[PDB]
Design a protein around this motif. Structure first.
Motif, short mmCIF file in Angstrom:
data_model
loop_
_atom_site.label_atom_id
_atom_site.label_comp_id
_atom_site.label_asym_id
_atom_site.label_seq_id
_atom_site.Cartn_x
_atom_site.Cartn_y
_atom_site.Cartn_z
N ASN A 162 -3.64 -9.24 21.44
CA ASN A 162 -3.30 -8.61 22.70
C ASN A 162 -3.79 -7.17 22.82
OD1 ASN A 162 -1.87 -10.98 23.40
ND2 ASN A 162 -0.02 -10.20 22.39
N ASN A 177 -8.47 -2.45 32.49
CA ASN A 177 -7.25 -2.32 31.70
C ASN A 177 -6.96 -0.87 31.33
OD1 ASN A 177 -7.74 -5.04 31.87
ND2 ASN A 177 -7.17 -5.49 29.75
N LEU A 221 -5.21 -5.69 26.10
CA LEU A 221 -4.40 -5.47 27.30
C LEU A 221 -4.53 -4.04 27.81
CD1 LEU A 221 -1.14 -7.53 26.69
CD2 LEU A 221 -3.09 -8.02 28.17
#
Ligand SMILES: *[C@@H]1O[C@H](CO)[C@@H](O[C@@H]2O[C@H](CO)[C@@H](O[C@@H]3O[C@H](CO)[C@@H](O)[C@H](O)[C@@H]3O)[C@H](O)[C@H]2NC(C)=O)[C@H](O)[C@H]1NC(C)=O
Ligand SMILES: *[C@@H]1O[C@H](CO)[C@@H](O)[C@H](O)[C@H]1NC(C)=O
Ligand SMILES: *[C@@H]1O[C@H](CO)[C@@H](O)[C@H](O)[C@H]1NC(C)=O
Ligand SMILES: *[C@@H]1O[C@H](CO)[C@@H](O)[C@H](O)[C@H]1NC(C)=O
Ligand SMILES: [Ca+2]
Ligand SMILES: [Ca+2]
Ligand SMILES: [Cu+2]
Ligand SMILES: [Zn+2]
Lengths: 478, 1200
Positions: free
Chosen positions: B641, B793, B644
Motif C-alpha cells: 500500500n 496520490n 497510496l
C-alpha cells in the motif's frame, strides 16, 4: 484492518508501555527455548496460547518436531548418525551414544588423507611423523611414524615401514609383518588380529591400526583426540582447510613444505619442490595409455559403487587411482590399482554399503590356495567382500571392540560349535584352544593380562603357559 | 507481417484557411528525398499507420527540423528502445537513442502489435490511437506532431481520421499568438474532401488534441453518433481523446460538423461533410406565455442576499420570463394542471420510435418565438428550414415530428433518451428567456434540468429593470456585480433549494437529467447518498456536457433528506442545489455475513509532495488507519500500500458484509467521513475535533460490480463538510466492494490480482484550510503556480513509490480524479494497454478521468522494466503529473555476490563483532575456523550496502559452528533503504506490523526466505530476534537489477543449440574431442570444454544467439582434465551484429581485460557495466594456465 481469522489471537501494542512483546516474539518450534530480542512491540496475529507456530501452521507444543539435516522428525522417533543414536524428546535429541572415531589414510604410493578429509600428495622419501600427540602441551601417549623407501617417480617397488611407540612399546609394521620389538607396559588392551587381507592392531581404547599388508595404512582415533594429535594426519579439529599446519604452528600453502616440516631424521635430504607431472613416464605422450587408465579408474563411479557416490567423496580416490595406474606398465597386474580399489571399497563398506567389485577379469582373488581340506585342515576358506574381523579364535577367544564393521578377504568358516585356530589353521573344539580365563576374560597362551593397573595392592600380572594360569604381584618401581 | 514507414519531421509553413509548424511526413524511400502524397482532407495530421493484431511496425524517423523529435506510440507494444520518451528508466544509452532524435539524426522504432493489443469481441474492427513527438509534450503537440494509429483485427486489411485540435502558437517550438481551434488543422469550414457515401455507414476515428484542459461537444447536423453501440447526439471530446464513432449517412448534401460550445463559436472548429452517392400520434397544444417567475419561493435570506433580496440595483427573485404551457383544447383557454417539480420546464413531450408528435404552437408572447426539438430529425410543417422560421405573436403553427430509427435508443442504451425542445429564433437569448422543455425518445419520469439562466441575455431585461428597480436610469448594465445577480443557476428553474422532489422509499425511479443553459463547462451531477445505474453500471457521479441529457435508473432504498447537486463549487454556492426527501409512503493451517471493522482518523501532517527526493512543506490533513479504537498506534503501511501516498486506506468489503468505520477527527477543524455507499434507516454528518462517529451499514448489490465487470469496484470516500477545500486539504480514499468469495479470509484482499489505486488531481494550496499557516511557514501571476501541484496520490515529478508489480500477472488499477473542471486527466500507461468493463469488454490505452468518477481497469504487463504512468495533458505533464512503475520478472533471481565475492568487504557492516568474526566473513559456504559474522551482543544488525538500488527477491541465511557449539539466527526481521537515512521494515504479505522470517536450526542448513512482494533497495539490513548462542550469520542475497537482466542465456541449462557455438580451431584426438559445443558451464564428462588445437593468444570462442540479445555478464570457468588444471586467467570480449564486423568491448577508452579464474573449478562472472546489445559474441583468451580451456555462461536478456 487487523483481521485475525480465528482461532488466531490478535495482539495490539499498547503504544504506551513500549516494552510489551508483540508479534516479533512469535513462539516457534525452532525458537521455543530462545530469548526474544525485540526492538519494540509489533501488532499482529498469533497462535493460541496452548500452541506454537510451525512454518504456516499452528501446532501443539507436544507435537513440535525435532530438526536434523534438511529434515524434521516427529516426537518419539529415532535417528542414527555415525556412532550415535538419538530419540526425539521435547524438541531435543536424547542420545544413547558410543564414542565416535575417525580414520586417517595413506592412500596410494604417496597420498595422504587426513582425519578432516583433506587429501594431498607428498612424494617424500624420508621418515615422517604420521600421527603424534606431542603437540605443545601433550600427555605423550603414542607416536606413529611412516617411512617410505622407493615411493619416488619409480614407485613400482616402493616399500613402507610403520614405527609405533605406545606405552613404552615399539611395534614395526613392514613387509606385511608385525614385529613387537619391545612389549608394551600394559598388554591387556594390546591386540593384533589378522582377518582376510587386513591386519588390525588395537593399541589401547582409542588407537587402531589397519594395514592391507602392502600399501594402505589407516590410523583410527576416537574423538577424544580432537585437539591432541598433530602431524601428516592433521590436528583432528574437524576443519579440512587447516590440516596443512606445520610442526611450528604455521599453515603451509604448499603441501611439500607441510610434509617436510614433519621430518624425523635430519640425515635424509628434504623433498624439493617439483612441478606436478600429470602424465608420468608410462602416460607421458601416450593418449591410449591415459585413456585406458581413465577407463579403469572410472569403475569407482560405476553401478556397483553407485550407492557409495552419495556417502564417500570419489574425487580424491579417483585421482589417486589415475596417478597410480599411470605409473603401472599394465593394468591387469597393477598392484596399486587393485589396492586403491580395495581401500575405496572398504571405506564404502564402513558406511554400510558393501560392494562386491572383485572378479576374475579385474583383480582376481581366490581362497583355493589355502583351502587344504584334504590336507587335514577342517576349515572352509571362503572369500567375503565384508566379513567381521573380530571373530572368536583360539588366539582371540575374548570378543574385541573391532574398529571396523567388516573387512574383505578369505575367512575360515567352521562347523557350528567349533573355533578356528590360526596356529593350526583349522577348526577345533572350544576347549582345545590353549586359553586361560581370569576375571571372566579368556586369553590365549603367552598373553599377559593386567588386573588393577592403578592399584598397587591389587595389581596382578597373569600369564598362560598352555592351560595353567599363573598370576604374580606387580613389582613396585619405588 | 512487417510494415515499413519512412517518417520525417519536416518543418513547413502552414495556413489554417501563415505560421511555422513541424509535421510528420511520410516518404517513399530510405533516402527521405521524395514525399509520399497525402489526401487534402488530412491536413496537419501525419500519415495513418495501420497495423493488424499480428503485425509488427518498423518506422524510420529522420529529424529534418531544427528541434529534437520522437515517436511515442499509444496502443501498441514496444521495447524500451522504441518507446520514444525520456525519463528515469535506468536503461543503457543504447536504449536511450529513441528518447530524442536531434536534428539531422535518424532512428528506427519497432512496434509489436500483440494479442494483448488487439480489439476485444465488443470493440470495433479497428481501435483508434495516435503517435506523437514526446520530447516536449506541449511544444510537440502545439507544433503539429501527431498522427493516427489504427490497430485492426487480423484480416481487416469509407473511414476518416478527424483531429479536433486546439493549436496554441504561443507554446510551440517556433514561439521564440492565437489559439486555433481546427479540424485536421483547418478553421472556418476550410477542410476539403470530407466526402461520404449515400446510404453506407461511415466510421470516424476521432482524435481530440489539446495541451490544456478544454472540452468540446461535436455535432453533425441532422445526424447521430454510434459510440460503443450507444446512440449519442454529440461527441464529448476531452483534450486528448481517442474514440470510434459510426454515423449512418442517409441524406444527400452538405452537412456541418462543428463544436457546439457557445464560447467556441468564434474559434472555428467547423468543417463540412458532403454525403453523396459513392403508429401512435400524440397531440400537444403548447403556447409561449409571458409571466413572472419566482426563482426562490418560500426562501428567507451573502449569496442569498446578492441573488434573491431586492435592492436599489438588485432585481430580486421575480423575473419576467416566457414559458411553454400545455393547453387542453385547440382554443387555448384552460391550461393543463402544472406540477411544482417541472418548474420552468414546458410540458414533457414523449415519443417512441415511429410515433408521431403533432405539435400545435401559438405564440401568445409579445415577441416572435418558435419551437423545435433536438435529437428528432424529421420535423415538417403539417400542411431554408423551420429551425430559423419565426412565429409572430398571436399566430398558430402546426409541426409534425417523426421519431425515426436513427433517433431512438439502441438495445444497449437505456429505454429512453433524454432530449429537449426550445426556440431556435435566437438560441441563447430565447433559452435564457425561459423557453425550454423536456423530450423523451424511447424504444418500442422525473425530469431534472440543470440550467444557468443569464437574465442579462433575456429579451425582458429592460422590462425587469423598469419594473423591479426604483431607478431604471441609474442602472449600469455593464457592472459585473449587477450582472452576477442576474445569472441564476437553477434546477428546473428553482434556485437555493426552492425545489424539493419527494420520492417513496423502496421504489424505482427513472431520472432524466439534462444540462442546458448559459453554462459552458461540464457538470458533475450527484445525489448525496445514492448510487444510480447509468449505462448498465452502478455509478456515483454523472458527467454532463452542455446541451446533453442522460437517463438514470435508481432505487430509493436510502431514506432521509439528501442534497442533489453538482460538484462545481461556484454553482454549488450560487444555489444550484435541490432537496430530495425519501420516506415511507488441534493443528491447523494459518493460511488456507461478517463485519469488517475499520478505524480511520483525520490527522494533520507535513507534506512536501515528494520534493525532498529550501523545499516547502505544507500542513495537510489526511485519512490515517489505526490498529484499534484507541487511535494511539497507526497501522503500518507496507510494500503493498506504499503507493497510496495521500490517498486514504483501502476499505475493502464484499456484498452482504457489514462495513463499520470508526472515524475520529484528530485535526483542528471539523471534518466528516462521507461515502455514497453509507446507507441509513436531516442528519448531522459533522464530526468536531476530538470526537468519534461510527458509520455502520450493509453492502448491497447497487454498491457492487455487476456480473460482467471486474471482481471489485472502487468508490471514493472523503469529507463532505466542504467538498472543495477538504479535497485540496488532502482528504480522499478508496473503498473497494468485491464479489462474494473474492477476498482472502486470512489477508482481506483479492490475492489473484495486484491492485493499485491512483488519484490524479491538481492540489491548490491557496484553496486549502491551511493556506494562511502554509504562507506563514513558507513565505518568510506566477505566485499561484508555486502553490499548485499536479500530483498523483500527492506526488509530482515521478516521485510516487510502491508501484512495483510482477511480470505476466494481472493488475487492477483504480483511477480517480477529483477537483474542478480542469481535472480532466488523460491517464496513459506508456507501452501498456488495459481493458474496461461497463457491460462488455473494451480495449483501451488512454482514459479520460472526470472528477468524482472512480474507474477500474485491468492490464497484463508483458515487458520488464521501468515504465511511466502519466497524464497526456501537456501542461499537467510538464507541471509534473507522472510517476514511475516497475514491472519485474520472477525468473531473474540470481546471487548478488555475497558468496561470489562481488560484494566487497566495504559494502558489509554491522553493529559490532565478537573477536575476529568480521562482518566481511558473513558469506554463504564460507569455510574456516572463523568463517562468519558473529556478535556477543543483543539487538544487533548486519547491513549490506549494494552500490545501486536493485530488486531483492530473497535471502539465503546460514549459521556456523565453533569448537563444539552451533551458532545461528533463529528469527530475524529485514529493513531496507535507498539512501541510508530512512529505514522501512519489510511487511510483504504479513498480517501484522512487519514480516517475521524464520532462520536456521543448525550450522549447515541453508534457510531461504523469500521477499514477495520484493524489496527495491540499495541498503538492506538484518536484525536478529532469536539466536542460539551468538548472532552468527552467513548470508547470500538473491536478487536482480531493475531492468531484470541478470539471468543466464542458456549454456548451463544447454538451451543453446550445438550449432550456435563455434571457434577458430578446436583440439581433437582419437579419444578426446574438445569441440566448442562442449564449453557449457558446469558440464561434466570427457572433453567437457573447448580447447583449440594450437595454443596462441589469437584464439576465440564464438556464440551466436541468432537474435539480438543484451549481454550484461559473462561467467567463465576452467577444467581439471587428466590431473591438469587448465583454465583461462585473462580474456577479452568482442561483439558483432552480422558475424563479420567485430569490435572489441573497450572500457574507459581502451580495451577491457577480464580477470578469469584462479582455480579451474570455481566460476567467475565478469559483469559489463555498459550492457552489450549484440547477436554474435566472441571470447579471446589472453593468458592461459596449462592449456587454453574455458567453460562459459552468458548472463543477459532478450531485446529487439
Ligand atoms: C505473497 O503473496 C503473493 C501474491 O498474493 C504470492 O505470489 C503468488 O503466489 C501464487 C502461488 O500461490 C502464484 O500462483 C501461481 O502462479 C503460476 C503462474 O501463473 C501458476 O502456474 C500456478 O498454478 C499458481 O497459480 C502467483 O503467481 C504469485 N504471484 C506473484 C505476483 O508473486 C507470494 O507467493 C506470497 N509470498 C509469501 C512469502 O507469502
Ligand atoms: C533419555 O532416555 C532415558 C531412557 O529412556 C531416560 O532415562 C532419560 O531421562 C532421558 N533423558 C536424558 C536427558 O537422558
Ligand atoms: C475565422 O473566422 C473567425 C470568425 O468567424 C475570424 O475572426 C477569423 O479571422 C477567421 N480566420 C481565421 C484564420 O481564424
Ligand atoms: C484535542 O485533544 C488534544 C489532546 O488529545 C488537545 O491538545 C487539544 O487541545 C484538543 N482540542 C480541543 C479540545 O478542541
Ligand atoms: Ca584440521
Ligand atoms: Ca528509451
Ligand atoms: Cu492532466
Ligand atoms: Zn470547441
Amino acid at each position: 484492518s487487523l483481521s485475525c481469522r480465528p482461532p488466531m489471537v490478535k495482539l495490539v501494542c499498547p503504544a504506551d508501555n513500549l516494552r510489551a512483546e508483540g508479534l516479533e516474539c512469535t513462539k516457534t518450534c525452532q525458537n521455543y527455548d530462545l530469548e526474544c530480542m525485540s526492538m519494540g512491540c509489533v501488532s499482529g496475529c498469533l497462535c493460541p496460547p496452548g500452541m506454537v507456530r510451525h512454518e504456516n501452521r499452528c501446532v501443539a507444543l507436544e507435537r513440535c518436531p525435532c530438526f536434523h539435516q534438511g529434515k524434521e522428525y516427529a516426537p518419539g522417533e529415532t535417528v542414527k548418525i555415525g556412532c550415535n543414536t538419538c530419540v526425539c524428546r521435547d524438541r531435543k535429541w536424547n542420545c544413547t551414544d558410543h564414542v565416535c572415531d575417525a580414520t586417517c589414510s595413506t592412500i596410494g604410493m604417496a597420498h595422504y588423507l587426513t582425519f578432516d578429509g583433506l587429501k594431498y600428495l607428498f612424494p617424500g622419501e624420508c621418515q615422517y611423523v604420521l600421527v603424534q600427540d606431542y603437540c605443545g602441551s601433550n600427555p605423550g601417549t603414542f607416536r606413529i611414524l611412516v617411512g617410505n623407501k622407493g615411493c619416488s617417480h619409480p614407485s613400482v617397488k616402493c616399500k613402507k615401514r610403520v614405527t609405533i611407540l605406545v606405552e613404552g612399546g615399539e611395534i614395526e609394521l613392514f613387509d606385511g609383518e608385525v614385529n613387537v620389538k619391545r612389549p608394551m607396559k600394559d598388554e591387556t588392551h594390546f591386540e593384533v588380529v589378522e582377518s582376510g587381507r587386513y591386519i588390525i592392531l588395537l593399541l589401547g581404547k582409542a588407537l587402531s591400526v589397519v594395514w592391507d599388508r602392502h600399501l594402505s595404512i589407516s590410523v583410527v582415533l576416537k574423538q577424544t583426540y580432537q585437539e591432541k594429535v598433530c602431524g601428516l594426519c592433521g590436528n583432528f579439529d574437524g576443519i579440512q582447510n587447516n590440516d596443512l599446519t606445520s610442526s611450528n604452528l604455521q599453515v603451509e600453502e604448499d603441501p611439500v613444505d607441510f610434509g617436510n616440516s614433519w621430518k624425523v631424521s635430519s640425515q635424509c635430504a628434504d623433498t624439493r619442490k617439483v612441478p606436478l607431472d600429470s602424465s608420468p613416464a608410462t602416460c607421458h605422450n601416450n593418449i591410449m595409455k591415459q585413456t585406458m587408465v581413465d577407463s579403469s579408474c572410472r569403475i569407482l563411479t560405476s553401478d556397483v559403487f553407485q550407492d557409495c557416490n552419495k556417502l564417500v567423496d570419489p574425487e580424491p580416490y579417483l585421482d589417486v587411482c589415475i596417478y597410480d595406474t599411470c605409473s603401472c606398465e599394465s593394468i591387469g597386474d597393477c598392484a596399486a590399482f587393485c589396492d586403491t580399489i580395495a581401500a575405496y571399497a572398504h571405506v564404502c563398506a564402513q558406511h554400510g554399503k558393501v560392494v562386491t567389485w572383485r572378479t576374475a577379469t579385474l583383480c582376481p582373488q581366490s581362497c583355493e590356495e589355502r583351502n587344504l581340506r584334504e590336507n587335514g585342515y577342517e576349515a572352509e576358506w571362503r572369500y567375503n567382500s565384508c566379513a567381521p574381523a573380530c571373530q572368536v579364535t583360539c588366539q582371540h577367544p575374548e570378543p574385541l571392540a573391532c574398529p571396523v564393521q567388516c573387512v574383505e578377504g578369505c575367512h575360515a568358516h567352521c562347523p557350528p560349535g567349533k573355533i578356528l585356530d590360526e596356529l593350526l589353521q583349522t577348526c577345533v573344539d572350544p576347549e582345545d584352544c590353549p586359553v586361560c580365563e581370569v576375571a571372566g576374560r579368556r586369553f590365549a597362551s603367552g598373553k599377559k593380562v593386567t588386573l588393577n593397573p592403578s592399584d598397587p595392592e591389587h595389581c596382578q600380572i597373569c600369564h598362560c603357559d598352555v592351560v595353567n594360569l599363573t598370576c604374580e604381584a606387580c613389582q613396585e618401581p619405588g | 507481417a512487417t510494415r515499413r514507414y519512412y517518417l520525417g519531421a519536416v518543418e513547413l509553413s502552414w495556413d489554417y484557411m501563415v505560421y511555422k509548424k513541424t509535421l510528420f511526413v511520410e516518404f517513399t524511400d530510405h533516402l527521405f528525398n521524395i514525399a509520399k502524397p497525402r489526401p487534402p482532407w488530412m491536413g496537419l495530421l501525419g500519415p495513418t499507420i495501420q497495423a493488424e493484431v499480428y503485425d509488427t511496425v518498423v518506422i524510420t524517423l529522420k529529424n529534418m527540423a531544427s528541434h529534437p523529435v520522437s515517436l511515442h506510440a499509444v496502443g501498441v507494444s514496444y521495447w524500451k528502445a522504441s518507446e520514444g520518451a525520456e525519463y528515469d528508466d535506468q536503461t543503457s544509452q543504447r536504449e536511450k537513442e529513441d528518447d530524442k532524435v536531434f536534428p539531422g539524426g535518424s532512428h528506427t522504432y519497432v512496434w509489436q502489435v500483440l494479442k494483448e493489443n488487439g480489439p476485444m469481441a465488443s470493440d470495433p474492427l479497428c481501435l483508434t490511437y495516435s503517435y506523437l513527438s514526446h520530447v516536449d509534450l506541449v511544444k510537440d503537440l502545439n507544433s503539429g506532431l501527431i498522427g493516427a494509429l489504427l490497430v485492426c483485427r487480423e484480416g481487416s486489411l469509407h473511414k476518416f481520421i478527424l483531429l479536433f485540435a486546439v493549436f496554441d502558437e504561443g507554446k510551440s517550438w517556433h514561439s521564440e499568438w492565437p489559439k486555433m481551434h481546427t479540424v485536421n488543422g483547418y478553421v472556418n469550414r476550410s477542410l476539403p474532401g470530407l466526402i461520404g457515401c449515400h446510404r453506407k455507414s461511415v466510421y470516424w476515428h476521432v482524435i481530440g488534441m489539446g495541451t490544456t484542459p478544454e472540452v468540446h461537444s461535436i455535432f453533425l447536423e441532422g445526424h447521430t453518433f454510434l459510440v460503443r453501440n450507444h446512440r449519442q447526439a454529440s461527441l464529448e471530446i476531452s483534450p486528448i481523446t481517442f474514440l470510434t464513432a459510426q454515423t449512418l449517412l442517409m441524406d444527400l448534401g452538405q452537412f456541418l460538423l462543428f463544436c457546439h460550445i457557445s464560447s467556441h463559436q468564434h474559434d472555428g472548429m467547423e468543417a463540412y461533410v458532403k454525403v453523396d452517392s459513392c403508429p401512435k400520434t400524440w397531440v400537444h397544444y403548447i403556447a409561449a406565455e409571458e409571466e413572472d417567475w419566482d426563482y426562490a419561493p418560500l426562501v428567507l435570506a451573502s449569496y442569498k442576499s446578492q441573488y434573491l433580496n431586492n435592492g436599489p440595483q438588485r432585481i430580486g427573485r421575480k423575473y419576467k420570463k416566457v414559458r411553454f404551457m400545455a393547453y387542453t383544447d385547440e382554443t387555448f383557454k384552460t391550461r393543463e394542471a402544472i406540477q411544482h417539480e417541472s418548474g420552468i420546464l414546458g410540458p414533457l413531450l414523449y415519443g417512441e420510435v415511429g410515433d408521431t408528435l403533432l405539435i400545435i404552437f401559438k405564440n401568445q408572447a409579445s415577441r416572435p418565438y418558435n419551437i423545435y426539438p433536438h435529437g428528432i430529425t424529421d420535423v415538417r410543417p403539417l400542411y431554408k428550414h423551420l429551425k430559423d422560421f419565426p412565429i409572430l405573436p398571436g399566430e398558430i403553427f402546426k409541426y409534425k415530428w417523426t421519431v425515426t430509427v436513427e433517433d431512438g435508443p439502441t438495445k444497449s442504451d437505456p429505454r429512453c433518451l433524454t432530449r429537449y425542445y426550445s426556440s431556435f429564433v435566437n438560441m441563447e437569448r430565447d433559452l435564457a428567456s425561459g423557453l425550454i422543455g423536456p423530450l423523451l425518445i424511447c424504444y418500442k419520469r422525473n425530469v431534472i434540468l440543470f440550467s444557468v439562466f443569464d437574465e442579462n441575455r433575456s429579451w425582458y431585461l429592460t422590462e425587469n429593470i423598469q419594473r423591479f428597480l426604483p431607478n431604471p436610469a441609474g442602472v449600469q448594465l455593464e457592472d459585473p456585480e449587477f450582472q452576477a445577480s442576474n445569472i441564476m443557476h437553477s434546477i428546473n428553474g428553482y434556485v437555493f433549494d426552492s425545489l424539493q422532489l419527494s420520492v417513496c422509499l423502496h421504489e424505482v425511479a427513472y431520472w432524466y437529467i439534462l444540462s442546458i443553459g448559459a453554462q459552458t463547462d461540464f457538470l458533475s451531477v450527484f445525489f448525496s447518498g445514492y448510487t444510480f445505474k447509468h449505462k448498465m453500471v452502478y455509478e456515483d457521479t454523472l458527467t454532463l456536457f452542455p446541451f446533453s441529457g442522460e437517463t438514470v435508473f435508481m432505487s430509493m432504498e436510502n431514506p432521509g433528506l439528501w442534497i442533489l447537486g453538482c460538484h462545481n463549487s461556484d454553482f454549488r454556492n450560487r444555489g444550484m442545489t435541490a432537496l430530495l426527501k425519501v420516506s415511507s409512503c488441534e493443528d491447523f493451517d494459518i493460511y488456507d455475513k461478517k463485519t469488517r471493522h475499520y478505524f480511520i482518523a483525520a490527522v494533520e501532517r507535513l507534506w512536501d509532495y515528494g520534493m525532498s527526493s529550501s523545499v516547502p512543506q505544507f500542513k495537510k490533513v489526511v485519512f490515517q488507519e489505526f490498529t484499534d479504537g484507541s487511535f494511539t498506534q497507526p497501522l503500518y503501511r507496507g510494500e503493498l500500500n506504499e503507493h497510496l501516498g495521500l490517498l486514504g486506506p483501502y476499505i475493502r468489503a464484499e456484498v452482504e458484509d457489514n462495513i463499520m468505520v470508526t472515524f475520529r477527527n484528530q485535526a483542528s477543524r471539523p471534518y466528516s467521513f462521507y461515502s455514497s455507499l453509507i446507507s441509513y434507516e436531516p442528519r448531522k454528518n459533522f464530526v468536531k475535533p476530538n470526537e468519534t462517529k461510527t458509520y455502520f451499514w450493509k453492502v448491497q448489490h447497487h454498491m457492487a460490480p455487476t456480473k460482467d465487470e471486474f471482481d471489485c469496484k472502487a468508490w471514493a470516500y472523503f469529507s463532505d463538510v466542504d467538498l472543495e477545500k477538504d479535497v485540496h486539504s488532502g482528504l480522499i480514499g478508496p473503498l473497494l466492494v468485491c464479489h462474494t468469495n473474492t477476498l482472502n479470509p486470512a489477508h482481506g484482499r483479492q490475492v489473484t490480482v495486484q491492485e493499485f489505486a491512483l488519484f490524479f488531481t491538481i492540489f491548490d494550496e491557496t484553496k486549502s484550510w491551511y493556506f494562511t499557516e502554509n504562507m506563514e511557514r513558507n513565505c518568510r501571476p506566477t505566485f499561484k503556480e508555486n502553490y499548485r501541484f499536479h500530483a498523483i496520490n500527492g506526488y509530482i515529478m515521478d516521485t510516487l513509490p510502491g508501484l512495483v508489480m510482477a511480470q505476466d500477472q494481472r493488475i487492477r488499477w483504480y483511477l480517480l480524479s477529483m477537483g474542478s473542471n480542469e481535472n480532466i486527466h488523460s491517464i496513459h500507461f506508456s507501452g501498456h494497454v488495459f481493458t474496461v468493463r461497463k457491460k462488455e469488454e473494451y480495449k483501451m490505452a488512454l482514459y479520460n478521468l472526470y472528477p468524482g468518477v472512480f474507474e477500474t481497469v485491468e492490464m497484463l504487463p508483458s515487458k520488464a522494466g521501468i515504465w511511466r504512468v502519466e497524464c497526456l495533458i501537456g501542461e499537467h505533464l510538464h507541471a509534473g503529473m507522472s510517476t514511475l512503475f516497475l514491472v519485474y520478472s520472477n525468473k531473474c533471481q540470481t546471487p548478488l555476490g555475497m558468496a561470489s565475492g562481488h560484494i566487497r568487504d566495504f559494502q558489509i557492516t554491522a553493529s559490532g563483532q565478537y573477536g575476529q568474526w568480521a562482518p566481511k566473513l558473513a558469506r554463504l559456504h564460507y569455510s574456516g575456523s572463523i568463517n562468519a559474522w558473529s556478535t556477543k551482543e543483543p539487538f544487533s544488525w548486519i547491513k549490506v550496502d549494494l552500490l545501486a538500488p536493485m530488486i531483492i527477491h530473497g535471502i539465503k541465511t546460514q549459521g556456523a559452528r565453533q569448537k563444539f557449539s552451533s551458532l545461528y539466527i533463529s528469527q530475524f526481521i529485514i529493513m531496507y533503504s535507498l539512501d541510508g537515512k530512512k529505514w522501512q521494515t519489510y511487511r510483504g504479505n504479513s498480517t501484522g506490523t512487519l514480516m517475521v522470517f524464520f532462520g536456521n536450526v543448525d550450522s549447515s542448513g541453508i534457510k531461504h526466505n523469500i521477499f514477495n512482494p520484493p524489496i527495491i533497495a540499495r541498503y538492506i539490513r538484518l536484525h536478529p530476534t532469536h539466536y542460539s548462542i551468538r548472532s552468527t550469520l552467513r548470508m547470500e542475497l538473491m536478487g536482480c537489477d531493475l531492468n531484470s537482466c541478470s539471468m543466464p542465456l542458456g549454456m548451463e541449462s544447454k538451451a543453446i543449440s550445438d550449432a550456435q557455438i563455434t571457434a577458430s580451431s578446436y583440439f581433437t584426438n582419437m579419444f578426446a574431442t574438445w569441440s566448442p559445443s562442449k564449453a557449457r558451464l558446469h558440464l561434466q564428462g570427457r572433453s567437457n570444454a573447448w580447447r583449440p588445437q594450437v595454443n596462441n593468444p589469437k584464439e576465440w570462442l564464438q556464440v551466436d544467439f541468432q537474435k539480438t540479445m543484451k549481454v550484461t555478464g559473462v561467467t567463465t570457468q576452467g577444467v581439471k582434465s587428466l590431473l591438469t588444471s587448465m583454465y583461462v586467467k585473462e580474456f577479452l570480449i568482442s561483439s558483432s551484429q552480422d558475424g563479420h564486423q567485430w569490435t572489441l568491448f573497450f572500457q574507459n577508452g581502451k580495451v577491457k581485460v577480464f580477470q578469469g579464474n584462479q582455480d579451474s573449478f570455481t566460476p567467475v562472472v565478469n559483469s559489463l557495466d555498459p550492457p552489450l546489445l549484440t547477436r554474435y559474441l566472441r571470447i579471446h583468451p589472453q593468458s592461459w594456465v596449462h592449456q587454453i580451456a574455458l567453460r562459459m555462461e552468458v548472463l543477459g536478456c532478450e531485446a529487439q
